[PDB]
Amino acid sequence: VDTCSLASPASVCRTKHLHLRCSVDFTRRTLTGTAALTVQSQEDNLRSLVLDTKDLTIEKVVINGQEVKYALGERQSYKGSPMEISLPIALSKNQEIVIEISFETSPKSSALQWLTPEQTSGKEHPYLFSQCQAIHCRAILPCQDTPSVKLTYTAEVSVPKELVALMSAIRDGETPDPEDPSRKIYKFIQKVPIPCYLIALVVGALESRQIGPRTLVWSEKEQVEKSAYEFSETESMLKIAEDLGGPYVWGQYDLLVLPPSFPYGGMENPCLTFVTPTLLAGDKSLSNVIAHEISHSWTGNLVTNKTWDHFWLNEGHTVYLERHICGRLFGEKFRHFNALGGWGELQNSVKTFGETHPFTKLVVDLTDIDPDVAYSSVPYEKGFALLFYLEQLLGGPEIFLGFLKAYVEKFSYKSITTDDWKDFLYSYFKDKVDVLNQVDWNAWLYSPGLPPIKPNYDMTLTNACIALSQRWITAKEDDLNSFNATDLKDLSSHQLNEFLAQTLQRAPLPLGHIKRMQEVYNFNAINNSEIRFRWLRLCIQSKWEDAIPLALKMATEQGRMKFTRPLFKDLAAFDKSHDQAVRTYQEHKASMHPVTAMLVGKDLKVD
Ligand SMILES: N[C@H](CO)Cn1ccc(-c2ccc(Oc3ncc(-c4ccn[nH]4)cc3F)cc2)n1
Numbered sequence: 001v002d003t004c005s006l007a008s009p010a011s012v013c014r015t016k017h018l019h020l021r022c023s024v025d026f027t028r029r030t031l032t033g034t035a036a037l038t039v040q041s042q043e044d045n046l047r048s049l050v051l052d053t054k055d056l057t058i059e060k061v062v063i064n065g066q067e068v069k070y071a072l073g074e075r076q077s078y079k080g081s082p083m084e085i086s087l088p089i090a091l092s093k094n095q096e097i098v099i100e101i102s103f104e105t106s107p108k109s110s111a112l113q114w115l116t117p118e119q120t121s122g123k124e125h126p127y128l129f130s131q132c133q134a135i136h137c138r139a140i141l142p143c144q145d146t147p148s149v150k151l152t153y154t155a156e157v158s159v160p161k162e163l164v165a166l167m168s169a170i171r172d173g174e175t176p177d178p179e180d181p182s183r184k185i186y187k188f189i190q191k192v193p194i195p196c197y198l199i200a201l202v203v204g205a206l207e208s209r210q211i212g213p214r215t216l217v218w219s220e221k222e223q224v225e226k227s228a229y230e231f232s233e234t235e236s237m238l239k240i241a242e243d244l245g246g247p248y249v250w251g252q253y254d255l256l257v258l259p260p261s262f263p264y265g266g267m268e269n270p271c272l273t274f275v276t277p278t279l280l281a282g283d284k285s286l287s288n289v290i291a292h293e294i295s296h297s298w299t300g301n302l303v304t305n306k307t308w309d310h311f312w313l314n315e316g317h318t319v320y321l322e323r324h325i326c327g328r329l330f331g332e333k334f335r336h337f338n339a340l341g342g343w344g345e346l347q348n349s350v351k352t353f354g355e356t357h358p359f360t361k362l363v364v365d366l367t368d369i370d371p372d373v374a375y376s377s378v379p380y381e382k383g384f385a386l387l388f389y390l391e392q393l394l395g396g397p398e399i400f401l402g403f404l405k406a407y408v409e410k411f412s413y414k415s416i417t418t419d420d421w422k423d424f425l426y427s428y429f430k431d432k433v434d435v436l437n438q439v440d441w442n443a444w445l446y447s448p449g450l451p452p453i454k455p456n457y458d459m460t461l462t463n464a465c466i467a468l469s470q471r472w473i474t475a476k477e478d479d480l481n482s483f484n485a486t487d488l489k490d491l492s493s494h495q496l497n498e499f500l501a502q503t504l505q506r507a508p509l510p511l512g513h514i515k516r517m518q519e520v521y522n523f524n525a526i527n528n529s530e531i532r533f534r535w536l537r538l539c540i541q542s543k544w545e546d547a548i549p550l551a552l553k554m555a556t557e558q559g560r561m562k563f564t565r566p567l568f569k570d571l572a573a574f575d576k577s578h579d580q581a582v583r584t585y586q587e588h589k590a591s592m593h594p595v596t597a598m599l600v601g602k603d604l605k606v607d
């Protein structure tokens, strides 16, 4: 049972295809059109079905050319309102019908962000982008909003002729709108069955540049050149991922660089990965996010979690594949460095929530819980830690990569649960069932806090980060002048970030230490969003007032929740910046992404 959906479960009926014909209205901030759902009955004598909707205005529902009866139930908070549709004829098991729903989105659609020209790079055109994961597809169109149902889709999107529409699908042509010569229709086709949370749309003054045989980088004109260089390893990463998980079945692997308000690092929308512009560091140092979104073309998009309770399967395996891709390109010691850093991020999440918090569990019960609120590093890092621990237990990376490939093949185009994964792991490793029977499955899968067993990690690249971090932490005022810019000479940007992350776990440091760090390291000049973020968190937690405008700026000039959310919390926890953080949130709230606004509001306790 998917307790996050109000629609009929896959055991009643299944959506096989969506044909979406819509028009993007920027003056009304509305998406108007028809969603034609080809639904297949799974039961005999099926006379009605229920769909998910959230803030959708419904004009009518047409089945076999005639308007049919429908009713919208009472709203269930973030879940939206159920939409019951009366079928005009009873269906036998396996019978299909097309249900054509005329709908209109609310300007407040939690799935969309409408941007005025001033909120874009070029300042001449408006912009739109969607974010459907996890349960926001219902805020775009009426659907069975559950990863347990996979469907194909075709789309026709009418937009002003000067703009470009893009979707998580193959571009299937374009023409002037016959009903409106000032608009253009962009056509799309997604031939591989996907869960609806993967349906994506972007409309803006977009340009493209080819960066590989099957990859174009899309963005506003001002960011194309920077993006083309930043993500130039995409094809090499696709070839490694193909070697690890089998053929790439999606045809195209495009990347879209979104405006700074994009709430996530990346979103694995099939054919068109969505990335935050905060990845544009100038040196490819944040390319693991691309390796991660590429990996989802197998774990997540081919093998999908049946419900959001089993989401760890999506991220845990993706982070596992991502670290193998980066391990193949830069070495095994680098995979251990990232894996160890990942354990440190799990330590932080477990500390923030508390070691008894149900959100630190690998498998959660999301009944009555908004998935956006449960979202954190736990499914990622705790999931990864389990696979890395199993890898060491079962004979090493080469043996465990054999399981991952067989796992992807076995469950391709399917939605599965933690028990499905576990039976397959036990089946594949039948000659090692004694080893598998030593795993504390109850604690690993269902217990809060840190995992019962910590894997083994090579320390070659981490040693230098811990050594410099410990030198600063143990330093007294008369040791401050022993620090020099030469302390960072043999540290890569990743090692600088791990140095700051280690130091931040012991924050605050004395204000004079933080002041000396800026004197010798000039961390204020670093543009790399990951390093900048940790440095400003260190400054704010260490109570440096000079860092307040810098932190307020980073929290508002970009909207990637990984940075915006903790920056606002740190600023709210510091008495000197508390009123400023609260006022800044209030004035930016209207211009913010609907989910980032809700979550920043909750963290700050501002309604
Ligand atoms: N996917 C790309 C990465 O490329 C980024 N992205 C965009 C949107 C989301 C998203 C994913 C899941 C989600 O809901 C859930 N969050 C956490 C848990 C959980 C906690 C412990 N165990 N399970 C279970 C959940 F259903 C909310 C938002 N992610």
Ligand SMILES: [Yb+3]
Pocket (backbone or CB within 6 Å): 172, 173
């Ligand atoms: Yb075609």
Ligand SMILES: [Yb+3]
Pocket (backbone or CB within 6 Å): 423, 426, 427
């Ligand atoms: Yb079994």
Ligand SMILES: [Zn+2]
Pocket (backbone or CB within 6 Å): 292, 296, 314, 315, 318
């Ligand atoms: Zn992911």
